[PDB]
Design an enzyme around this catalytic site. Structure first.
Site, PDB file in Angstrom:
ATOM      1  N   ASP A   1       9.067  32.432  58.085  1.00 33.87           N
ATOM      2  CA  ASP A   1       7.741  31.835  57.961  1.00 33.87           C
ATOM      3  C   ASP A   1       7.685  30.825  56.809  1.00 33.87           C
ATOM      4  O   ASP A   1       7.281  29.686  56.984  1.00 33.87           O
ATOM      5  CB  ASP A   1       6.684  32.924  57.771  1.00 33.87           C
ATOM      6  CG  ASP A   1       6.416  33.706  59.048  1.00 33.87           C
ATOM      7  OD1 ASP A   1       6.657  33.131  60.130  1.00 33.87           O
ATOM      8  OD2 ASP A   1       5.966  34.879  58.976  1.00 33.87           O
TER       9      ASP A   1
ATOM     10  N   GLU B   1      -7.026  33.828  53.968  1.00 33.94           N
ATOM     11  CA  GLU B   1      -7.259  33.016  55.141  1.00 33.94           C
ATOM     12  C   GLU B   1      -8.737  32.786  55.432  1.00 33.94           C
ATOM     13  O   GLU B   1      -9.228  33.052  56.541  1.00 33.94           O
ATOM     14  CB  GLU B   1      -6.569  33.665  56.332  1.00 33.94           C
ATOM     15  CG  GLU B   1      -5.111  33.955  56.045  1.00 33.94           C
ATOM     16  CD  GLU B   1      -4.372  34.519  57.234  1.00 33.94           C
ATOM     17  OE1 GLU B   1      -4.994  35.233  58.049  1.00 33.94           O
ATOM     18  OE2 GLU B   1      -3.158  34.246  57.348  1.00 33.94           O
TER      19      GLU B   1
ATOM     20  N   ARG C   1     -10.407  37.220  55.221  1.00 30.49           N
ATOM     21  CA  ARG C   1      -9.621  38.318  55.781  1.00 30.49           C
ATOM     22  C   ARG C   1      -9.218  39.328  54.713  1.00 30.49           C
ATOM     23  O   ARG C   1      -8.599  38.976  53.715  1.00 30.49           O
ATOM     24  CB  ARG C   1      -8.369  37.777  56.478  1.00 30.49           C
ATOM     25  CG  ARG C   1      -7.285  38.804  56.786  1.00 30.49           C
ATOM     26  CD  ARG C   1      -6.040  38.101  57.363  1.00 30.49           C
ATOM     27  NE  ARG C   1      -4.940  39.036  57.606  1.00 30.49           N
ATOM     28  CZ  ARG C   1      -3.775  38.715  58.168  1.00 30.49           C
ATOM     29  NH1 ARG C   1      -3.533  37.464  58.564  1.00 30.49           N
ATOM     30  NH2 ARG C   1      -2.849  39.653  58.346  1.00 30.49           N
TER      31      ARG C   1
ATOM     32  N   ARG D   1      -3.946  41.425  69.141  1.00 26.70           N
ATOM     33  CA  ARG D   1      -4.573  40.109  69.146  1.00 26.70           C
ATOM     34  C   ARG D   1      -4.648  39.555  70.550  1.00 26.70           C
ATOM     35  O   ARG D   1      -3.931  38.612  70.886  1.00 26.70           O
ATOM     36  CB  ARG D   1      -3.789  39.139  68.264  1.00 26.70           C
ATOM     37  CG  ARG D   1      -3.891  39.440  66.786  1.00 26.70           C
ATOM     38  CD  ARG D   1      -2.835  38.688  65.969  1.00 26.70           C
ATOM     39  NE  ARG D   1      -2.988  38.961  64.547  1.00 26.70           N
ATOM     40  CZ  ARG D   1      -2.240  38.425  63.591  1.00 26.70           C
ATOM     41  NH1 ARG D   1      -1.265  37.580  63.901  1.00 26.70           N
ATOM     42  NH2 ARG D   1      -2.469  38.744  62.325  1.00 26.70           N
TER      43      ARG D   1
ATOM     44  N   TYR E   1      -5.231  33.791  65.501  1.00 27.31           N
ATOM     45  CA  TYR E   1      -6.051  33.227  64.439  1.00 27.31           C
ATOM     46  C   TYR E   1      -7.270  32.524  65.007  1.00 27.31           C
ATOM     47  O   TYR E   1      -7.258  32.080  66.145  1.00 27.31           O
ATOM     48  CB  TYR E   1      -5.225  32.242  63.604  1.00 27.31           C
ATOM     49  CG  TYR E   1      -4.461  32.896  62.482  1.00 27.31           C
ATOM     50  CD1 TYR E   1      -4.070  34.222  62.568  1.00 27.31           C
ATOM     51  CD2 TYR E   1      -4.155  32.196  61.324  1.00 27.31           C
ATOM     52  CE1 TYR E   1      -3.379  34.821  61.551  1.00 27.31           C
ATOM     53  CE2 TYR E   1      -3.474  32.797  60.294  1.00 27.31           C
ATOM     54  CZ  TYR E   1      -3.089  34.108  60.418  1.00 27.31           C
ATOM     55  OH  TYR E   1      -2.404  34.712  59.399  1.00 27.31           O
TER      56      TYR E   1
END
Ligand SMILES: CC(=O)N[C@@H]1[C@@H](O)C(C/C=C/c2ccc(C)cc2)=C(C(=O)O)O[C@H]1C(O)[C@H](O)CO
Ligand SMILES: CC(=O)N[C@@H]1[C@@H](O)C(C/C=C/c2ccc(C)cc2)=C(C(=O)O)O[C@H]1C(O)[C@H](O)CO
Ligand SMILES: CC(=O)N[C@@H]1[C@@H](O)C(C/C=C/c2ccc(C)cc2)=C(C(=O)O)O[C@H]1C(O)[C@H](O)CO
Ligand SMILES: CC(=O)N[C@@H]1[C@@H](O)C(C/C=C/c2ccc(C)cc2)=C(C(=O)O)O[C@H]1C(O)[C@H](O)CO
Lengths: 387, 387, 387, 387
Positions: C69, C196, C211, C288, C322
């Protein structure tokens, strides 16, 4: 604001590389149109390379090239000078299997000719929109410069041919403003033949050096007044510049009439330098290979064969092709004269090549007050392709 | 409106990442040119990455790399800083196998050198059109910075070399306005050798840190006045920054003369900080791998070897290469001094790699008033490619 | 001219589709970056989709996704809202593995954070050029919104986190003008955790719904004054909107403190509607997948669980991810209030998929004074790919 | 500055080729969307081709075409007239499986309809941002022109249908300013059926020639006042122009009522010429192949079957499809009347083709004061593709 292209053509000693697109090398893996006639014209802000496409891409079955020259898919599009004719950068210009384009200072005007041989239509575009039309006036493949047309103080002039490719045909001069045809003239030229004119502005008139596909290995020349009255004849120089053609020796200089037995030819160009001329020609007298440019003293006005300069740009181990003229807007060159420039088309594939396809890359040269060394900026592509 | 680049170079403590193009990773599947020398210069509106291409694309037979450095297909083009050198975004700049570019505030001027070694021509472009020329003056591969040239109040200056790569050669400073050459100077430097200068503006003069390929492992420095009178010599710091080079210890600091036995080198850069200097160098003393940047106290003016800062940007497990300088227009940085920036070229493929091809990606750093941590923003590509 | 974003958030009844990029379907054959966090922000002229790339393309070995990442190749770039993140349209924004962007009315300011976990640097860009910096202040993966930041009368505000992902970390508010940091604040929030943030402007202050990755399944809320004094707490509504999370029943509404046992979460958003709130959440309480948006009466200010509206946008047979907030410039919506909008990221590939790779497409919704029917504008891609 | 489209439609004798995109030929190797309905509208500066995509590319598994017409991935995007609908040039317009677009002189307004059949939403975009909405008012696949909508002095008008495709449905006229709906009308038309209207401006009113999918092989016509009062009926000419349809002989001309037994149809267009009409139709009475355009004397106002002109543009050995109307801004044509233009969609693949996929290329024609010869500018693609 319109362009004033009334100035004199700069007196140039030699020619410097302007751009090279590397289109065909690039298109071995990228998405490049298969094109022909990569001619160049300039707005007051940028120069562009116009080209005809068959709607196909290099390394694709549609480049198959059994497809016809005057097909329904043929189109004029354009990119910035030096960029390859790739699909993403490309700007659509016109439905055309024969074309000319020029910018007048405000907007671009282009002219695409399409439809059937017996009754073609030539659509005039202005600011990217059709504004006017011309129909085949003689029913035999109407056609035009394949090179920059010429705008002088808001009005643009170009030349067209309707008739046979060999024997006698017919020739006209057209004059547009803002995309509207406002004048036309028939060009009397018995014995003479005119095609694919390479034109530039000079001393407020329009000068072209065209192609005789009938009878002459010297090039026709005309000079157009803004009133569409004109002089016409041949380039006087006692050196042949068509292809094919014979030895310069075996040669006669005619201001008046076609000179060699040979039929056929190729599109070429030339720049008047006072009385001298810069003439271009393929190096091979027989095939379209190599490309050089000679300066001849008093060549514009006399049967002269006095070389002041010979400058090679493509060597004779390499393919060339069409060539054409265009001028640099004063509003870019910064100069006070019109810098003469020209493009050289370099053709790969059929007929001289093992391939199913045929396209060309280009290379562009400009003005300059210095002798520039001989070199070859040839195409470069490694044929054949994945196919 | 012209650019006033008369201000002082900002005094920077460390360097922050500006951009990374990821060109080669991206070109594993996309259509990216195979390039070299991804140098950066800025207009008053945007910064661009210039690069030389061979007209070929990554993962294509034409990337074959047996092709010559000074080929007829070599060209300068450009994209926005950070974008990869892909075919679609690319802007054609010049026919060049060696180049410099700078924007003066009104338009971009670029300089491509091409043609044959014995008589190369360097074409000056202004606003995307040739405006002037320079011919080989010594008949031995005419060449230039490969990094941003320098515009101060409307007039742009760059440096060129005509001569042998090893032994003594010849060096000149040129000065143009609006693409017209208006001044030139010969640079006397017997024993000294200059190549691939990395130049920036400072206190109204032009400062460069160049490459000695003959005799020195320290870098030549010159400082050009707007009248083309100049000082020239070496970067005083008692630390070698060429590649290859010896230990810093085994080392002598010479403001005056080349210092180590080693021949050869690589393009590098350095920024004057009052009396200190930010110097860049590869981490490996022998190969072009890793890249760091040291600040040396009184290094501009003395044989100092006092490190105030060491900041790594590419680690020594990774390939680097050319590096160069450029400034941020005040009209973007917002500051009142000229923010110093530099690019690092990262090379993949031949010779250190199993591949038929060679290209490079880049990474760009800028100014900043803070220590920035050490990291490696290396190239990333997974070699070799489908081939 | 700066943007006045001082108006009230429009009171919207429902949400209409703004755009869909179809990035991943398209990238099955085209050249699309493999991205994450396709967030949206708007200049006074156009809205753009920002995204992080790994420098790789879909259907290419480099999408291999074992890649980290926070890699050296991670970058922020951008396209026009609705266009896919393809290589050709893409605009380079910053070297970043975490980012926020907002336009102030004159130019875009972006913030990329990169470098090492123990000492990351966050570079501020203004007008496409670094202008300032922030270093890790706590040595633990410095990070930020991954969603539009917020510009009110020339000054832009965003929120960052430096610390552990689970346990207590540290949180700050930053305030820039023209890319220069001009103010900062520490955010006291013991027991609380913030990451975030999805922020928008409202009544001249900045409101975010962030978050909590530590302890709460309700979302933190803060409200920033232009003086960087702030209120902070949780979204009062008695309905959990984090993922994962428990039944709404099994649930308590806390304006004050984190509510459910669950650790972890996902980026989400919410819009204050007077006293009510539009809150977004995945449909699945555990994974998600699916995405809906509920309006809760007095949810901003009370522990309310009164649903006025439920509107599905992605059905629970489909992957989401997201989500984030952004406002429509008055200078485009034409309205007199700030039209609330949001994006939903839809993720394909690893971990829930058979593939070597992971990316996401997006879909964008806006404001509107009407109930809009339930539908699913899911991703669409046919996995897995040629690989 | 708003557009004054109050002028009369120019009286044109024939139609010249405007553009051809060659999309499908090109997409055999390039990255072209698989599209439908390539309609054209013009701003005061350029004309664009709008199209619906499925988010897929030609020669890719996602072109699989078992995918539904009204899918969640369907979108309106656009390119410059003549450019192919490739991914790189494409501009995102709206989430739509049915659309209309028009520019008012200041900005583009588009209308995409999406969501579920039982409650579709139609989002209005203005300047590339949603500004307003319309919900299914009758719960049965809300839909619209699939052709340029019409802006007269700042206010734009288009027509929509909510109801069954066969039997009686419902029809409305909408009127927006700057993307805000400001008026609407129900259209009474019992026995009559209206779909896919092709509209242009004329004498300050809006004229459309639409599609009856219920009962008539003649085309509905309506004429909208700026007050949304309207006349409606059929195109009087005693010649059928729907597809399928019967012989012209076997035929009756009805200003009033649908004429032939046939159900079904295709989108078509027609231009009022004083009292005459230019009507378009496929050449085959049964399949969508070939395309011609007839001028009928007194055809607008009488049951006339007097042909003054027949002009072929696609021959009956070739596939055609949808067709539509649009006008050239005076601010480009230079004329003092509104030059009538139209596009012809040419469809390849399913159902008449062996392929897994279906798309279309287009070809555009304009105005002109001259007879233009018959030709076929057909699609050209060599089916099937690599698949
Ligand atoms: C309108 C039109 O036909 N103009 C012609 C033009 O198209 C070309 C160029 C060819 C492109 C091409 C490409 C791939 C293949 C396989 C074959 C040809 C030539 C030429 O001399 O080369 O001649 C023009 C011409 O016929 C003469 O002037 C005599 O009248
Ligand atoms: C004009 C010109 O030749 N300038 C040279 C320049 O091209 C390069 C760069 C090379 C690109 C490259 C790419 C793929 C391969 C397989 C091989 C080479 C280098 C270099 O030191 O790396 O040296 C310059 C040079 O010769 C010296 O300064 C000594 O005079
Ligand atoms: C700076 C940074 O690390 N921010 C993280 C951010 O990167 C992502 C997004 C991931 C992209 C991705 C893509 C492909 C694969 C295979 C794996 C991951 C997530 C996430 O929750 O999804 O969490 C952030 C985070 O760690 C938490 O907020 C806890 O602190
Ligand atoms: C909103 C909507 O459904 N509008 C329809 C529109 O989509 C199309 C166009 C089709 C594109 C397409 C592409 C690939 C395949 C495999 C199949 C179809 C047609 C048409 O007549 O062709 O009809 C409209 C319609 O149903 C009628 O007007 C009757 O009401």
């Amino acid at each position: 604001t319109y362009m004033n292209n009334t100035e004199a053509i700069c007196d140039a000693k030699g020619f410097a590389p302007f751009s090279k697109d590397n289109g065909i090398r690039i298109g071995s893996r990228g998405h490049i149109f298969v094109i022909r006639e990569p001619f160049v014209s300039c707005s007051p802000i940028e120069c562009r390379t116009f080209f005809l496409t068959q709607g196909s891409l290099l390394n694709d079955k549609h480049s198959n090239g059994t497809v016809k020259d005057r097909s329904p898919f043929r189109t004029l599009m354009s990119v910035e000078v030096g960029q390859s004719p790739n699909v993403y950068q490309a700007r659509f210009e016109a439905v055309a299997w024969s074309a000319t384009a020029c910018h007048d200072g405000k907007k671009w005007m282009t002219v695409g000719v399409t439809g059937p041989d017996s009754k073609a239509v030539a659509v005039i575009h202005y600011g990217g929109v059709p504004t006017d039309v011309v129909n085949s006036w003689a029913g035999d493949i109407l056609r035009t410069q394949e090179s920059s047309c010429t705008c002088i103080q808001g009005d643009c002039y170009w030349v067209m041919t309707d008739g046979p490719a060999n024997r006698q045909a017919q020739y006209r001069i057209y004059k547009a403003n803002q995309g509207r045809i406002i004048g036309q003239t028939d060009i009397s030229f018995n014995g003479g033949h005119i095609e694919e004119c390479s034109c530039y502005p000079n001393d407020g008139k329009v000068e072209c050096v065209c192609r005789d596909n009938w009878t002459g290995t010297n090039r026709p020349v005309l000079v157009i007044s803004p009133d569409l009255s004109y002089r016409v004849g041949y380039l006087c120089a006692g050196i042949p510049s068509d292809t094919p053609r014979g030895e310069d020796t075996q040669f006669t200089g005619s201001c008046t009439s076609p000179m060699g037995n040979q039929g056929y030819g190729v599109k070429g160009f030339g720049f008047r330098q006072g009385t001298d001329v810069w003439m271009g020609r393929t190096i091979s007298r027989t095939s379209r290979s190599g490309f050089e440019i000679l300066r001849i003293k008093n060549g514009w006005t006399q049967t002269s064969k006095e070389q002041i300069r010979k400058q090679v740009v493509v060597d004779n181990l390499n393919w060339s092709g069409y060539s054409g003229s265009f001028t640099l807007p004063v509003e870019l060159s910064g100069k006070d004269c019109l810098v003469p420039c020209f493009w050289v088309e370099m053709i790969r594939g059929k007929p001289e090549e093992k391939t199913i396809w045929t396209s060309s890359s280009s290379i562009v040269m400009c003005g300059v007050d210095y002798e520039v060394a001989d070199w070859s900026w040839h195409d470069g592509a490694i044929l054949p392709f994945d196919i």
